[PDB]
Amino acid sequence: ALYPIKSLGAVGVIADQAPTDLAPNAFTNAINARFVEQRVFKTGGNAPLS
């Protein structure tokens, strides 16, 4: 038995839906996270500038 969660970057955070009825790649929670094309990686951070 396997649960392959592929294409993590298809869609991001969702609400107004049961957490049990979300699609496998309908993965939902993100803070400082960037979703593009088919991949998930950390968003660019904040640094000062002068």
């Binding site: 392959p4 294409s7 990686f41």
Partner: peptide, 25 residues
């Protein structure tokens, strides 16, 4: 009803994840 958390706090990391594969019974 399983949940998993992925946390990346490391500084020099530019890593990325394409997908997962849950081995389960």
């Amino acid at each position: 009803y399983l949940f998993y958390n992925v946390i990346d706090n490391d500084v020099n990391s530019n890593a990325a994840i394409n997908g997962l594969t849950i081995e389960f019974a």
